[PDB]
Design a protein around this ligand. Sequence first.
Ligand SMILES: Cc1cn([C@H]2C[C@H](O)[C@@H](COP(=O)(O)OP(=O)(O)OP(=O)(O)O)O2)c(=O)[nH]c1=O
Ligand SMILES: [Ca+2]
Ligand SMILES: [Ca+2]
Ligand SMILES: [Ca+2]
Ligand SMILES: [Ca+2]
Ligand SMILES: [Cl-]
Length: 901
Amino acid sequence: MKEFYLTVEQIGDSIFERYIDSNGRERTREVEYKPSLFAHCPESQATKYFDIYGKPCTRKLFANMRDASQWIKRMEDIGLEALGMDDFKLAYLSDTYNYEIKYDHTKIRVANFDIEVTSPDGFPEPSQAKHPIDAITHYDSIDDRFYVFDLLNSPYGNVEEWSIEIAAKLQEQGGDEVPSEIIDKIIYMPFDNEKELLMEYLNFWQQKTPVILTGWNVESFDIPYVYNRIKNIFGESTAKRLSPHRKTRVKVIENMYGSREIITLFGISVLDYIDLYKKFSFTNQPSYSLDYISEFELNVGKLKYDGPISKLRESNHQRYISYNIIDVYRVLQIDAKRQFINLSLDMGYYAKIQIQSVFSPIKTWDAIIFNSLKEQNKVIPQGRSHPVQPYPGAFVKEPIPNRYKYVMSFDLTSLYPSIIRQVNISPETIAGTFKVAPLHDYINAVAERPSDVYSCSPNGMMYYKDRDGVVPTEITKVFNQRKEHKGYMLAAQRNGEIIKEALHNPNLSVDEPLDVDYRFDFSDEIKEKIKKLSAKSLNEMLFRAQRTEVAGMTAQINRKALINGLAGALGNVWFRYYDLRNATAITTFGQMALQWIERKVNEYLNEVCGTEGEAFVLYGDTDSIYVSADKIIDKVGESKFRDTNHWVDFLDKFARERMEPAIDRGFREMCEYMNNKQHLMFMDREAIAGPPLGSKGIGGFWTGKKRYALNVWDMEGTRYAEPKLKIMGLETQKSSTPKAVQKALKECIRRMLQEGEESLQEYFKEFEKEFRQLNYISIASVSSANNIAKYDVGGFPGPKCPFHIRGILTYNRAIKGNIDAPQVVEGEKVYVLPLREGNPFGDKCIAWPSGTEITDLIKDDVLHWMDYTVLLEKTFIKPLEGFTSAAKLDYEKKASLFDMF
DNA sequence: ACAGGTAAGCAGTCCGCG
DNA sequence: GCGGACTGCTTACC
Ligand SMILES: Cc1cn([C@H]2C[C@H](O)[C@@H](COP(=O)(O)OP(=O)(O)OP(=O)(O)O)O2)c(=O)[nH]c1=O
Ligand SMILES: [Ca+2]
Ligand SMILES: [Ca+2]
Ligand SMILES: [Ca+2]
Ligand SMILES: [Ca+2]
Ligand SMILES: [Cl-]
């Protein structure tokens, strides 16, 4: 089989690499790598190395890696460009793997792990590691085994072995309910003492050394804690065994509130799942406890126990171990759904970087572009330094706040990358400039055609049409992968809607779910086979379909993220190819494109309706238009259609047959006008939106930019079983609005768009009446805890102190003394509650770490002195007023004037 | 340091206001 | 005694 790397590191003048050989065997080697850089030389001097502009370079081989760096320095000490890949790991990878890497994941050792530390001192600090490690569950992807290391004796109690027979049993039967499918995969190891526990774990680490190291919060807690515990006990030399090469960097970086520490383990690629999740999940969560994320992701419960966690090992060691095992499995369950490790392997190898570098779009693209260039014997430029300059981005239309009954939207496919490809924007495709008319002259086709020779952006830049450019070339590739997985995604979604429809005719029948690939539109026979199936079998299929979709979502949205990131990278001063000329060429062309088609789309319909100079496009952001479809519908009359589904099927056909071809012609012209390389501005219909037929519903509304709600029947060719609410920017979407309140505002909106005003009033009446009975956690606000210190000033609110920061201050003050209550972690999320007039906290609000319940030390005073009125007013009524005003409705019954009857 | 800009709403502070 | 203008902060939308 083809060879592939596991990990690479540079230590002094040597490169350390773990890899899989041509026989599937894991090997390590240290290489005295001889790097090669480049300097400009005279035109006459004939070589085969040219920089990106076509200027000739000379290659310089260095005896060791230090020599190469010293030269770079000496060249800056002179003032001449020092060219080539300065990060030697990437050049080594590029040299050692001159082909497209096809890896075998079953050969890659991914370790998933978690530890427990009993601590009656408050949170056990990794930097200090004062308390014993008393459990380690470590899953190995190669062995398919959960390795459990369990301490029975410690300063904080002595405990009987864990029982796997009990662990397996129901909660409802006094067991722990550890899943069947992993019961047989547990390797249990009791330990007399911590010394042996740790000593054994290290020898285990040696024989099954992780390549990919993951888990929950593993980089802020488990890794640092185990490193430091071993360091405190056996010395830093032993602790260094956690690195296959024995080298570790310790980034001290503290804060005002003590000492936090991050350890780098050379030879291992650490991918903390919380960071994977934050980067790839595209959620903004109110809390990042595993319980919370497990629940959100897998719809599994809370992992319940009695008393605090600090007292769990002693009171119930049985459950203490099972819960540690389950925590590890949970991350695995999340990864089987989200596929983030898989994604990271794909990108890492695609680009030829350290896998952990996937967190860096700049590092990722530098390498892709580097390798691409290396293939044509071209030489990359030196990374220079620049001042940060702001630059303009997208255009957003200011909309008329209002209800809108029938709405149809249209969106451009991968716009910024498409613009890159259409215009041919790349560091070496720059041809010159032209003098720019103000933007609106390009929008309305008044300004003279900028060039007859080059491809142009309304920002005044001109690019060669004939050549290629690495950026377009490399961007097009990742785009095509994007399009592939999007395709799989949408079809899985389409299929999922068909299963939903079928769940109205569930057959009284005993069968198994169909063996089908959900990435592809179901065939007629499969469809025919589906109606006759049972509920039990249909639901299994639905679940699978969704699972396919999530998988496809992950692959698609994150390639999109990466390609959009190149476009922004052009405007990050650390990117090798930083260049505001190019970044600005992207954004400005975007602004023109959007407004150009707004002109065209208003023009077309005004002709097609005979009407004169009416507005149809009511909104647009960046690359989207929202078209007011009322006149098209009225041209036929709501009298007809019989059902909702008729007029949707109408509008759809009108979009695909009439609008798009006009839209296409519009973008053809603009491409011509701009004289671009290839037309790639593709705008197809997205959402079809309105109320159920002849209902009291308003269909949709806007409040301003970035804030609207629509009742969507069809989205990108997916016809929903039930109409789905598209809500953008409103409080229902924000992680800072109380859960109960999101839910209720969503129903108010649902009731606004699907049913009428009465329905909405009826609900508002109910909600307010019932509000005081909801759980405190459900009605609490959420916020991040940035810059606590800055505003601290004696433990009381400093100047211009933010509302939430104030609330933490009241917390801290109220938990003074008993270091036992959890401390608000700086930069983490908190619940916030307003405090009622004249309370014992001596301030007007309180905050505490999210996920958690507040410690009982203050819980009951918080519940009593709770300010429901200010909560209701601020978080619910206020935003509702916003929605209904814009919608021209009232949430409360108005004074009839007739009431005197 | 190690993708980008655009933009909304909520509070705090300071000022004008018979 | 409070509303408006401005700014800090937070979290959305592309
Ligand atoms: C979502 C997003 C968009 N954008 C910019 C670049 C996008 O080309 C443009 C429009 O964004 P989107 O409409 O969200 O998506 P897209 O055009 O990139 O791709 P698609 O429509 O197929 O999903 O806005 C970013 O710069 N960063 C981002 O994270
Ligand atoms: Ca734990
Ligand atoms: Ca689309
Ligand atoms: Ca788009
Ligand atoms: Ca869009
Ligand atoms: Cl230590």
